[PDB]
Amino acid sequence: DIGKYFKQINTFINIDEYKTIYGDEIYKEIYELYVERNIPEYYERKYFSEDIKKSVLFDIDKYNDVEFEKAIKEEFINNGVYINNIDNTYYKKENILIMKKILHYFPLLKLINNPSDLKKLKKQYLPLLAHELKIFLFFIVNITGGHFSSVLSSLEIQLLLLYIFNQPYDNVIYDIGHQAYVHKILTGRKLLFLSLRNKKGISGFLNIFESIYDKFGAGHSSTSLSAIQGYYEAEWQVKNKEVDKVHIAIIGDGGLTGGMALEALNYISFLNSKILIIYNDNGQVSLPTNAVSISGNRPIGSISDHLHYFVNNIFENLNYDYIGVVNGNNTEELFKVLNNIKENKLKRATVLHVRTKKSNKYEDMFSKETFTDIYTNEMLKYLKKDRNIIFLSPAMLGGSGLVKISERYPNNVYDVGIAEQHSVTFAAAMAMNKKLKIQLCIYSTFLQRAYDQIIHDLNLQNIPLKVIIGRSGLVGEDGATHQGIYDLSYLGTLNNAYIISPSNQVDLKRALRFAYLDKDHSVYIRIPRMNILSDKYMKGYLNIMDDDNFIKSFIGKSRIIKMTKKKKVCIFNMGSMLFNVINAIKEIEKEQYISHNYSFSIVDMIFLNPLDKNMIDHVIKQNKHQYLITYEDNTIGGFSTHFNNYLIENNYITKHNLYVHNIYLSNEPIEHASFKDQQEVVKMDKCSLVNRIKNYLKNNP
Amino acid sequence: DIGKYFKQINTFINIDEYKTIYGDEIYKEIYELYVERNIPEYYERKYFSEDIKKSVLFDIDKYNDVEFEKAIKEEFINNGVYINNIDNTYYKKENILIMKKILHYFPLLKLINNPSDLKKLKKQYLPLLAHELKIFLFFIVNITGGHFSSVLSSLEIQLLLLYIFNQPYDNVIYDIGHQAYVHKILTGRKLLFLSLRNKKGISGFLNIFESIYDKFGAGHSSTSLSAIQGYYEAEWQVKNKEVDKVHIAIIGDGGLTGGMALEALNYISFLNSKILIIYNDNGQVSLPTNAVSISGNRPIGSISDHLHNNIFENLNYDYIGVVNGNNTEELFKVLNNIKENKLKRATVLHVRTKKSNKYEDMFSKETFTDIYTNEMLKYLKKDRNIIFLSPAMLGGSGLVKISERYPNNVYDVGIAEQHSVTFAAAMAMNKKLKIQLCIYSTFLQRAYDQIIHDLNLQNIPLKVIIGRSGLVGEDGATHQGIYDLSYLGTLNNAYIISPSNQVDLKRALRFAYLDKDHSVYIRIPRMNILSDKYMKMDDDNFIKSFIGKSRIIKMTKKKKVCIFNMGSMLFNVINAIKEIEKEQYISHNYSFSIVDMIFLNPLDKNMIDHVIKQNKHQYLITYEDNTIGGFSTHFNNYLIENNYITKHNLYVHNIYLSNEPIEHASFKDQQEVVKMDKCSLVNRIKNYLKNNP
Ligand SMILES: Cc1ncc(C[n+]2csc(CCOP(=O)(O)OP(=O)(O)O)c2C)c(N)n1
Numbered sequence A: 001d002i003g004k005y006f007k008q009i010n011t012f013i014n015i016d017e018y019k020t021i022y023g024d025e026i027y028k029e030i031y032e033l034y035v036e037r038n039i040p041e042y043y044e045r046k047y048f049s050e051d052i053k054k055s056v057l058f059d060i061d062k063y064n065d066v067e068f069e070k071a072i073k074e075e076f077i078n079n080g081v082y083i084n085n086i087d088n089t090y091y092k093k094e095n096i097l098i099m100k101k102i103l104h105y106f107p108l109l110k111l112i113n114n115p116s117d118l119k120k121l122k123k124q125y126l127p128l129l130a131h132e133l134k135i136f137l138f139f140i141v142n143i144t145g146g147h148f149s150s151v152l153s154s155l156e157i158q159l160l161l162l163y164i165f166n167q168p169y170d171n172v173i174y175d176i177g178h179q180a181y182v183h184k185i186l187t188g189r190k191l192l193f194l195s196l197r198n199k200k201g202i203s204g205f206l207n208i209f210e211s212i213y214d215k216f217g218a219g220h221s222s223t224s225l226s227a228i229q230g231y232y233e234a235e236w237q238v239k240n241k242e243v244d245k246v247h248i249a250i251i252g253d254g255g256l257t258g259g260m261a262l263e264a265l266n267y268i269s270f271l272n273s274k275i276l277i278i279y280n281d282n283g284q285v286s287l288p289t290n291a292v293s294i295s296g297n298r299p300i301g302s303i304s305d306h307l308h309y310f311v312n313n314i315f316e317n318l319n320y321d322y323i324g325v326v327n328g329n330n331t332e333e334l335f336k337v338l339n340n341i342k343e344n345k346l347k348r349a350t351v352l353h354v355r356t357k358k359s360n361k362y363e364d365m366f367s368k369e370t371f372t373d374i375y376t377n378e379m380l381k382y383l384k385k386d387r388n389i390i391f392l393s394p395a396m397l398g399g400s401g402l403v404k405i406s407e408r409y410p411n412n413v414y415d416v417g418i419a420e421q422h423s424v425t426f427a428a429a430m431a432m433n434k435k436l437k438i439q440l441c442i443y444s445t446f447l448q449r450a451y452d453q454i455i456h457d458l459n460l461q462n463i464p465l466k467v468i469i470g471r472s473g474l475v476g477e478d479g480a481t482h483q484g485i486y487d488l489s490y491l492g493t494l495n496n497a498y499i500i501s502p503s504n505q506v507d508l509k510r511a512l513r514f515a516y517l518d519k520d521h522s523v524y525i526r527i528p529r530m531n532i533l534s535d536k537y538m539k540g541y542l543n544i545m546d547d548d549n550f551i552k553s554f555i556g557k558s559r560i561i562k563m564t565k566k567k568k569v570c571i572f573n574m575g576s577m578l579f580n581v582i583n584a585i586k587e588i589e590k591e592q593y594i595s596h597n598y599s600f601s602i603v604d605m606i607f608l609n610p611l612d613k614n615m616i617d618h619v620i621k622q623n624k625h626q627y628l629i630t631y632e633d634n635t636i637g638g639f640s641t642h643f644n645n646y647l648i649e650n651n652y653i654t655k656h657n658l659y660v661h662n663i664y665l666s667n668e669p670i671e672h673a674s675f676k677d678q679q680e681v682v683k684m685d686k687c688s689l690v691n692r693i694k695n696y697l698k699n700n701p
Numbered sequence B: 001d002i003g004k005y006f007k008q009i010n011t012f013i014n015i016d017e018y019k020t021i022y023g024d025e026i027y028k029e030i031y032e033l034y035v036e037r038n039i040p041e042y043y044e045r046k047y048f049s050e051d052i053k054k055s056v057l058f059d060i061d062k063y064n065d066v067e068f069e070k071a072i073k074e075e076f077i078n079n080g081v082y083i084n085n086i087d088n089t090y091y092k093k094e095n096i097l098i099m100k101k102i103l104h105y106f107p108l109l110k111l112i113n114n115p116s117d118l119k120k121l122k123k124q125y126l127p128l129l130a131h132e133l134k135i136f137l138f139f140i141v142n143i144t145g146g147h148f149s150s151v152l153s154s155l156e157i158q159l160l161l162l163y164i165f166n167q168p169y170d171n172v173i174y175d176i177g178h179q180a181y182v183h184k185i186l187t188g189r190k191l192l193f194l195s196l197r198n199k200k201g202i203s204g205f206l207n208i209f210e211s212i213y214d215k216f217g218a219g220h221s222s223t224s225l226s227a228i229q230g231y232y233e234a235e236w237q238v239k240n241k242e243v244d245k246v247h248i249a250i251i252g253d254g255g256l257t258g259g260m261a262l263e264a265l266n267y268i269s270f271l272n273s274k275i276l277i278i279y280n281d282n283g284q285v286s287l288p289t290n291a292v293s294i295s296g297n298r299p300i301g302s303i304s305d306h307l308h309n310n311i312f313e314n315l316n317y318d319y320i321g322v323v324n325g326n327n328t329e330e331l332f333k334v335l336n337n338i339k340e341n342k343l344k345r346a347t348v349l350h351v352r353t354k355k356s357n358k359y360e361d362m363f364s365k366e367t368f369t370d371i372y373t374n375e376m377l378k379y380l381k382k383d384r385n386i387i388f389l390s391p392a393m394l395g396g397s398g399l400v401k402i403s404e405r406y407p408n409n410v411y412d413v414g415i416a417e418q419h420s421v422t423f424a425a426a427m428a429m430n431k432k433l434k435i436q437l438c439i440y441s442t443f444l445q446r447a448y449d450q451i452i453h454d455l456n457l458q459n460i461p462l463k464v465i466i467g468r469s470g471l472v473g474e475d476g477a478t479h480q481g482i483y484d485l486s487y488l489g490t491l492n493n494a495y496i497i498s499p500s501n502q503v504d505l506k507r508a509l510r511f512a513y514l515d516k517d518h519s520v521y522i523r524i525p526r527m528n529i530l531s532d533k534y535m536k537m538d539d540d541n542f543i544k545s546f547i548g549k550s551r552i553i554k555m556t557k558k559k560k561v562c563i564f565n566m567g568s569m570l571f572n573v574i575n576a577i578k579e580i581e582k583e584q585y586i587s588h589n590y591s592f593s594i595v596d597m598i599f600l601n602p603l604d605k606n607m608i609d610h611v612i613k614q615n616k617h618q619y620l621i622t623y624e625d626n627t628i629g630g631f632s633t634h635f636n637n638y639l640i641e642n643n644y645i646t647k648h649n650l651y652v653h654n655i656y657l658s659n660e661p662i663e664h665a666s667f668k669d670q671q672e673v674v675k676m677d678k679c680s681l682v683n684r685i686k687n688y689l690k691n692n693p
């Protein structure tokens, strides 16, 4: 029985305040439908002004598998879902059965699948539907995972934008897309929601390849305003060269802190684009915000404090029509305002300030701890003796591991909001002080915004700034928007840039000890989004001093993993997926053919600038290895470039008759899936490795 | 005679308004010193409170060459100039003699060489000095080149900041650094100002390797506020772990339009950093602003409209009202009050200012940007659905002639590279329009998360025009476009075209016009089009014959060596090949072939394998106008995929721009420095051939 889960979900929701917010009649309706479980016999007549064409969910028992699959495919196509991008296993008969079992406990939600079925609900009962969605999320994101609180924050906004305006004819764009689950539910994607953030399933972000209701997809913030202005200006130019559409952008307080968002706001006002900007004010700018920083728990930004006090303001100074602070969780008042905007027309850009609420084997080779925990522990140890370490983060204190540092040394942490560019330049200016050590913690994907500051402001001036790069390699369920696979490819193009790519926690400790002791080098350390390897794995597989000796023994000193005449093949591993190479090598030697006609050596590279050419020439010229295969956890242009270019410098292929091969993550969007599945997709896992090495050995003898 | 130049400069400067701005006494002093040329005999007593220790500029005749060089080196070192970073020829005896000749015509400027010598001038005569600088720039930038109007815009700001505050103890940071010539003049670098934006001379931007008075180098806008906040927070943390110094940032209206500047402003207010922000309001946001865009000549930004409780007051800033920037007395009053007191809160001093008041035989006068403009206008004549965008670089990108004639077709977004790329991408999802984004190579470095995450990930068919690719020249290392192929080549769903001459550029433009399903990048170089003397179809046929179709330049048994050229430096390879065969040894033991590659994605492996398996070439050398990770990566990796080097006895070499800061110099000198010129090419190829036989 699943009813106990729904009862517990309802208990977790404060039902008493429903009366005060809405009214006695609304409270009674909600209590009867969702608490007393009293459903009318003809509730469709009571709650809907017109009859609704039901889905194939209620005619499932009368279908064979082939016909049922064809019918569900046609239904998804007619509701705008590009079903060919979803694996068929998802829309089978059993999955639809499970979804029906879930939806039977939702009298109004089980009968709504498209905006047309939404508009047949009586307006006065809109809060009731808003309650059902609230339970549904609590049942789905609990099982599949993803962003939760932000979805509840803007539930009424999505509901009312679907109810009132005519999408997809009218353009509506969200900012980060991690809170638009309700938008997906009422646009034809409800039945597939059990496949959230899996292989060939529903993404956690809006995608222009899932449906037509997703005008622009994003996972990086501060993008909605520019995107919606582009939509408005294109739809204005098309008519000019020959605007009944309503262009709406929903951006939160945190998103507006980003520079691109501010530029877009300024330009939207400047051009006077008839865009409604729903500023979702919720009190959260960074992740998280309750953490104590150098500026307290206050949300980051003078705009945030000004708007909280104002609850002429900033928007009015920028020549915006301002509708006062309107509750975002009140369907009545927001309905009034949005319906007025619909019936009328925007004669100038308008900001609808809205207040909302937020709080209200493979497995045996990885332990529970994370590399970021190791980073935090080392930084705490180094802070215990030296207080001149300054940490910065672009609104990612929790992910970067700085929260435990901000609590204990609040004056040592600067949370600049979503200000990657500002974070880099600020930290660089703070690193010019020889009496301070500055470490900047930023994700691999977010450094793509600040590469220009890394090059122009940090690399030209040789400023000794330490940059900690988190979430490097394959992230997992977040998707292609969060793929940290461009670190070595863009950092390796710069001089003065020491780059360290630890594979296990020991190399991470040594890299951070070097960064602590170093005072004249800009050092980047690539921390993977991965658990630390197990000690048993380190001993069995990896086979694993004063200041001057350590510094001499660390920089550019690669670690040796494994060391009719056989052909000798050496693999140069750079990155964090060395475990795949080790297991592939352990698997290959079982077969007699390769174990008789070949021998293998594995060399672990921890550096990209400078490179350990001594180890390369030890393998090439001393032990006379034949084949050379690189293995990097990065896309093209990384370690393969440096290894190939060093060999081309010295013309080793002519000298030693070397066959060369390269293995790296493919240059195709690594879609949302698990980390193991992501390894399997790019064919970089153990079995794919053994297959590829066998093919290469047996193709070039 | 040099006096005629000074007379012409005096005529070019409006001296009548000096009376109205300052007063009759100041007008009389200015007219007597600078117009009437009535210089007293003991004017140092009249104008200065204390005596000034003169430089070796007056005792130059008493020295030999070596002793004078040592003395001037010591003088430069004691005035803060890191003279070891400047070529010795710039402080020879003759250069100092010429600078002395120039300075003798400046009664007060010849006697001032450092802040200490500046503070000995009477306050009432500060306008007089402010006039001298105005002439001096009018004489030096005219000879050396660089940014001119912006320096005159903030002349009083720099002069007064030097006069009033204790630099370099107090931290003062400018935004872009193209406006700080007066700051360089009165910090010990005046004598070297003839070597402006030359090889091993003084830069056109503030550099932390030229002097201690430069606290943060610039070149990309929107950086001053973050840098000054970093300085303030470091100075605060040092004291906390154990602020008498004044932290001042001078940022203009255009600089604040950039997103990083806005974030820095918000965060400075948020943390209550005691920073004085001199908002240089001049009415100029983009380059230029008089161009007729979709919004006319109006300066870009609602902040510009609001200014030119305010926005600053809403952001919890102390606001001193609009103060004139060319009035020395009023700004002196305000800044002197700030000095005598001390900021108890972040303060924005709104200030209003004013803005308007052979190698050679192989290049013609036309620039590839002109070709781009002509082609785009020709295409606009038949189709009106072409939309152009640029981040505040209409003149440089070549869009001015497009904005003037099709104002509804151009969106000048200010310094909004990120906004420009995302805006254009969202505008490119409309299948009824063609969107071309024009952006410089270095400025595109700010727009990378949007190129990857927003444009390439969603396969949006946006055309991007990259200007100033390769070596730019006098602008310096901050403007080096040597990362286009290294960061764009890591892109699926991305066609990249790197024309070497105008014909390939026009073909790329025709493809981008006809194409409707690909994101196409075209690398226009900062170079003139090649001379026609040097060089000497339907839609489906052209599209088939263009994409991934490289061009052939030139094509005991001789060893055969082939060079794969990618980029815009093909003329160097052509001349190197023409020169190398003159020697009998190489012309007997080798034969050469040159293949011009125009595409990084998709690649013309047909031409590669034609040279590698049909004509049976032996050696392979790549040549690109880009840094590491560009074409060399793709060529080497393709050869590694097919294992051609092992099976077919290949020697491989690569020639690309060095990964070291290419300092400010001429384009020819910049080619010489990276050893990528003709003579260096012949030397390198000879060495490689004769080292691996
Ligand atoms: C450019 C960028 N930087 C950082 C993040 C990480 N991030 C995700 S949630 C968040 C803050 C969200 O703030 P807001 O816009 O108010 O969203 P809400 O909490 O209202 O959903 C941040 C910094 C991001 N998504 N994009």
Ligand SMILES: Cc1ncc(C[n+]2csc(CCOP(=O)(O)OP(=O)(O)O)c2C)c(N)n1
Pocket (backbone or CB within 6 Å): B150, B151, B153, B175, B176, B179, B219, B220, B221, B222, B251, B252, B253, B254, B255, B256, B258, B280, B282, B284, B285, B286, B287, B391, B392, B393, B415, B443
């Ligand atoms: C990041 C960046 N984008 C573009 C440019 C090109 N650019 C040079 S001058 C200028 C505008 C300068 O505006 P403002 O800050 O008012 O300077 P001022 O005219 O006062 O010297 C621009 C966009 C630049 N220098 N930096």
Ligand SMILES: [Mg+2]
Pocket (backbone or CB within 6 Å): A252, A253, A254, A281, A282, A283, A284, A285
């Ligand atoms: Mg928030």
Ligand SMILES: [Mg+2]
Pocket (backbone or CB within 6 Å): B252, B253, B254, B282, B283, B284, B285
């Ligand atoms: Mg300006």
